[PDB]
Design an enzyme around this catalytic site. Structure first.
Site, mmCIF file in Angstrom:
data_model
loop_
_atom_site.group_PDB
_atom_site.id
_atom_site.type_symbol
_atom_site.label_atom_id
_atom_site.label_comp_id
_atom_site.label_asym_id
_atom_site.label_seq_id
_atom_site.Cartn_x
_atom_site.Cartn_y
_atom_site.Cartn_z
ATOM 1 N N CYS A 152 0.859 -1.173 0.000
ATOM 2 C CA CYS A 152 0.000 0.000 0.000
ATOM 3 C C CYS A 152 0.898 1.226 0.000
ATOM 4 O O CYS A 152 1.673 1.448 0.939
ATOM 5 C CB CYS A 152 -0.937 -0.009 1.223
ATOM 6 S SG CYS A 152 -2.008 1.444 1.285
ATOM 7 N N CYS A 208 -8.906 4.223 -0.984
ATOM 8 C CA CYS A 208 -8.441 4.451 -2.360
ATOM 9 C C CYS A 208 -7.006 4.987 -2.428
ATOM 10 O O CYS A 208 -6.491 5.553 -1.457
ATOM 11 C CB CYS A 208 -9.453 5.302 -3.188
ATOM 12 S SG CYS A 208 -9.528 7.123 -3.027
#
Ligand SMILES: O=C([O-])c1ccc[nH]1
Ligand SMILES: O=C([O-])c1ccc[nH]1
Lengths: 311, 310
Positions: B93, B237
């Protein structure tokens, strides 16, 4: 040096039947020593950025209710509080006060018994029970209208009561829906369609009050009712709808002053209540349980563009 | 007795351009001393309730990304991390790694410099700059399709690129919208209609991948681009920088090593470069994370939502 590059606000988070409350224990600026109402006026005018820091993302959320802990004016009060949310400043908050009282016990400030809490709308009476649940005496509640009829788009006609219990509610029993925790999607869809129907029809509370809470009720094998509440948005803090329900029961002669009423939500939270008559309505007292979720220090860095919240 | 009626989990929250990350410093059960992937498997199988306690309401939210801090296997790594969110466990991430590295600095574990972070999907390289921003080397990005034609319901036709940058993006320049902070409602409605049109048309990424991120770009007087991303929903997101870089590279608009500067409509700025790799580009993205909170999550024995509201 680095330490001094950010402000610190100490908080304790709890939830009452899954609705979150954030007690600010320290870190706001001094608001003087007037009544909670006067301190709230100072906060709102001079230091509103502190509210947004605590309630708005990224540190909070739109469903969060905040309470600033204050030293009360009278020494026989356990505390003073000022309630706020994402839009502004509140008066009294029932489920929030359950959280506050539980939190004060967690902090070691009070033991079981009766306590008074100062607020901008007057002094609130609460009982902390031995199991650490709390009975809170709420604001005046009343029914504005009975058996108001509308067509719910996609579902068909229904009747409900319009009632005030610190929020405007439309209350429905004959909705044809299955009120159970495994059915929240269908229930949410129904209630949303109801709110839309109210809008289209221009159905409101007294003085054009926006009915932004919908409560669906059903028989329950263990309690007097099982309910589902749809909260404002799809966003602002949610009531449990107990007070509003009591005002309708009282107006219909279904529940006497002092008689105990027991309600469960679809997620399992249980509330016990009674009321006393007052001029223009009832004063309900609601018992519920809050659970702790976190102790925290919020950090507000000087160079963080969203240090006072994302607006 | 009272103290022992509840579990405690120490966390630090940050946000990178408003997107929150929660670093779990301590309080999870031991997951062994294997690789991050092997520890993740133990966590997912034996202790998933700890994930939900952290991410789910009331203690978290749907947009929250979590990261469990672990002792790495290599002594050359500054840390190990297992990323997770509301639906389960993640690999890498980007914006989350920016938060993690900033947070390690706040903890006093690292100073400015280059650091390696073990994850279940491999070791990530990051640079902590003196100003405490972080450049993170991301996963492989590539463009899947160029100039895909699409009818947007209620708007009219557009061309977009389908690209992968840690997620499937539809990237549009010719949307006819005003990409500005004070215009998010109309931007949201438009991007939603786009996603719906992608659904209706059966338009996907490679291997039928769902395109759940929409990015609308525009010229900017201060930067190479201003962007608005519509995130899935609700769930976290990315900000679409990597995917955009992949299209720029494929179009011969940006060379390897050249610096690209992108601002979001809320004002967050990212600087980036890429290097060519097999099957695409490896982008390195620089951004800033700020601290939100230090906390001890409390998990009471009697609270019915102690492991989260499911
Ligand atoms: O339903 C209510 O009015 C209530 C009061 C305190 C908690 N819930
Ligand atoms: O692709 C992106 O937007 C990104 C931001 C931080 C790391 N990657």
């Amino acid at each position: 040096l680095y330490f001094q590059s950010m402000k610190r606000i100490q908080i304790i988070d709890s939830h009452t039947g899954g609705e979150p409350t954030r007690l600010v224990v320290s870190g706001f600026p001094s608001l003087g020593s007037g009544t909670m109402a006067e301190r709230r006026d100072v906060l709102a005018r001079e230091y509103d950025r502190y509210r947004t820091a605590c309630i708005l993302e990224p540190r909070g959320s739109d469903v969060l209710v905040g309470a600033l802990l204050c030293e009360p004016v009278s020494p026989d009060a356990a505390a003073g509080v000022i309630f706020f949310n994402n839009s502004g400043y509140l008066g009294m908050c029932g489920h929030g006060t359950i959280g506050v009282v539980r939190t004060l016990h967690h902090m070691g400030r009070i033991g079981p018994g009766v306590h008074r809490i100062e607020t901008p709308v007057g002094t609130v009476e609460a009982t902390l029970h031995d199991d650490l649940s709390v009975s809170v005496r709420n604001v005046l509640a009343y029914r504005h209208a009975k058996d108001v009829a509308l067509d719910v788009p996609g579902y068909g006609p229904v009747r409900g009561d319009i009632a005030w219990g610190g929020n405007w509610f439309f209350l429905i029993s004959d909705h044809g829906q299955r009120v159970a925790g495994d059915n929240v999607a269908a229930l949410t869809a129904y209630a949303s369609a109801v709110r839309e129907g109210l809008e289209r029809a221009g159905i409101t509370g007294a003085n054009g009050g926006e009915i932004d809470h919908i409560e669906l009720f059903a028989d329950d094998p263990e309690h007097d009712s099982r309910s589902f509440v749809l909260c404002p948005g799809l966003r602002s803090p949610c009531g449990t709808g107990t007070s509003a329900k009591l005002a309708c029961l009282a107006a219909d002669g279904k529940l006497a002053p002092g008689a105990v009423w027991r309600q469960a939500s679809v997620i399992g939270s249980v509330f016990h209540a009674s009321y006393v008559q007052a001029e223009g309505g009832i004063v309900p007292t609601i018992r519920g349980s809050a659970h702790l979720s976190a102790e925290a220090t919020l950090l507000i860095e000087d160079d963080d563009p969203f240090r006072w919240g994302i607006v």
